[PDB]
Amino acid sequence: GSSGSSGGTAVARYNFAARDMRELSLREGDVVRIYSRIGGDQGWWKGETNGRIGWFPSTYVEEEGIQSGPSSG
Numbered sequence: 001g002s003s004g005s006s007g008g009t010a011v012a013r014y015n016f017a018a019r020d021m022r023e024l025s026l027r028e029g030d031v032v033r034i035y036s037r038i039g040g041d042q043g044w045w046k047g048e049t050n051g052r053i054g055w056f057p058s059t060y061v062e063e064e065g066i067q068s069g070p071s072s073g
Contacts, residue, residue, distance in 0.1 A: 024054030
């Protein structure tokens with residue numbers, strides 16, 4: 001597999017080391033998918049990346065939106 005698409009993904013703009021086995025480690029430039037918006041604590045989101053699943057903050061990441069496609073010089 002190893003396939004993915006755009007739509008509900010966040011990019012860790014800042015390095016974040018998970019303290020609890022429940023949390024998810026974030027690395028500068030690590031994309032994360034948004035599975036559930038609410039479930040445990042407000043703000044925190046449940047995603048998955050690098051074959052790891054857990055709880056990661058949304059404030060440390062940046063929700064990727066519109067993306068420029070056909071852009072010439």
